[PDB]
Design a protein around this ligand. Structure first.
Ligand SMILES: OC[C@H]1O[C@H](O[C@H]2[C@H](O)[C@@H](O)[C@H](O)O[C@@H]2CO)[C@H](O)[C@@H](O)[C@@H]1O
Length: 371
């Protein structure tokens, strides 16, 4: 189920899990408890799978959109900070982790996608999606490409689909209408079609994934990429000269990334929910704990902790991150977010490889989600 006397932590691989072990150590030092940190693949899926059979990690880290689902199947545990603690953190971040009024996780940081470009290849980044194909033309005649980003994860294609009107679930009367989905509206269709046109006019590859795009950009073979703050760490090492800026517009409207709040929740069956409360409120959610994690891999634009946020809000990458977040939308945490991601993942993939037209693909997805 767990062990008792120890703390198992699960974090995704793209995150500062090493800086997280460091806080772990200081914890174990000050305390005496063994703190293990793992980062299994498909963590988001694996969790409930195990958390269910009464076992798994003590603490689970994921963006908040998955938390409502977990809370629903009962795998989480209600947390209980007090006006002392809660006040250290920005209000809207606490709101991101409330499932039916209740707090089911601790908010760490706001994540938003940004346009990352090679200042060597491109000193001036495009202002619009529309000029990318042309840019690619006169980059391709040099064994280079204009852009590559992960097309295998809907999170990365969402900003474009959402720019002209696509939407997940309509928000009405302080609640999401689960039957009013905008994955198959005019806006969503226009965004995807454009994407598909990029592929079909050989400006992009239907297969590009996280690794391929990371490598491509880090190696200097692509002028631009789309990713979050976690990625800066690795780019700092490739030593490519890069800027981080606002995603390009689509049909004159801003790209609208789905904004995630990195959060930490405690397993329903963690025998040491006490140890967990200690480590999360006392060691990690501190200027010192956040600095440890951040130095490993950038946390994001805005951190939940108001005082730490007092120092990291000056960087031009952080700033662009805050700009894109601003134009974006905080994700819902409702349990149906999982069906949404699954249906959308299939749609883009099917449309992009040509097994389905944009129309068939998005209709399928819309059906799947409201069924
Ligand atoms: O691609 C759908 C998934 O999108 C988000 O996942 C993000 C996550 O928020 C981010 O912190 C981690 O870096 O990148 C993944 C994208 O691969 C949602 O949080 C997931 O629930 C969705 O499945």
């Amino acid at each position: 189920k767990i062990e008792e006397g120890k703390l198992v932590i699960w974090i995704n691989g793209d995150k500062g899990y090493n800086g997280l072990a460091e806080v772990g150590k200081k914890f174990e030092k000050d305390t005496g408890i063994k703190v293990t940190v793992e980062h299994p693949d498909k963590l988001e899926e694996k969790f409930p799978q195990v958390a269910a059979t009464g076992d798994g990690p003590d603490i689970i880290f994921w963006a908040h959109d998955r938390f409502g689902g977990y809370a629903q199947s009962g795998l989480l545990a209600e947390i209980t900070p007090d006006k002392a603690f809660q006040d250290k953190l920005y209000p809207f971040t606490w709101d991101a982790v409330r499932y039916n009024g209740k707090l089911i996780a601790y908010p760490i940081a706001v994540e938003a996608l940004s346009l990352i470009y090679n200042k060597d290849l491109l000193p001036n980044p495009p202002k619009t999606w529309e000029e990318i194909p042309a840019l690619d033309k006169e980059l391709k005649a040099k064994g280079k490409s204009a852009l590559m980003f992960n097309l295998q994860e809907p999170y990365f294609t969402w900003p474009l689909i959402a720019a002209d009107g696509g939407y997940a679930f309509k928000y009405e009367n302080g609640k999401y209408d689960i039957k009013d989905v905008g994955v198959d509206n005019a806006g969503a269709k226009a965004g995807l079609t454009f994407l598909v046109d990029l592929i079909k006019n050989k400006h992009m590859n239907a297969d590009t994934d996280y690794s391929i795009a990371e490598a491509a950009f880090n190696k200097g073979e692509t002028a631009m990429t789309i990713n979050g703050p976690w990625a800066w760490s690795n780019i700092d090492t490739s030593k490519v000269n890069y800027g981080v800026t606002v995603l390009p517009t689509f049909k004159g409207q801003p790209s609208k990334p789905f904004v995630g709040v990195l959060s930490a929740g405690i397993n329903a069956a963690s025998p040491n929910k006490e140890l967990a409360k200690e480590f999360l409120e006392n060691y990690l959610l501190t200027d010192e704990g956040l600095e440890a994690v951040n130095k490993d891999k950038p946390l994001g634009g805005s951190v939940a902790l108001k005082s730490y946020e007092e120092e990291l809000a000056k960087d031009p990458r952080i700033a662009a991150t805050m700009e894109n977040a601003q134009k974006g939308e905080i994700m819902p945490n409702i349990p149906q977010m999982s069906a949404f991601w699954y249906a959308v993942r299939t749609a883009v993939i099917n449309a992009a490889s040509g097994r389905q037209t944009v129309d068939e693909a998005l209709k399928d997805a819309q059906t799947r989600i409201t069924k």
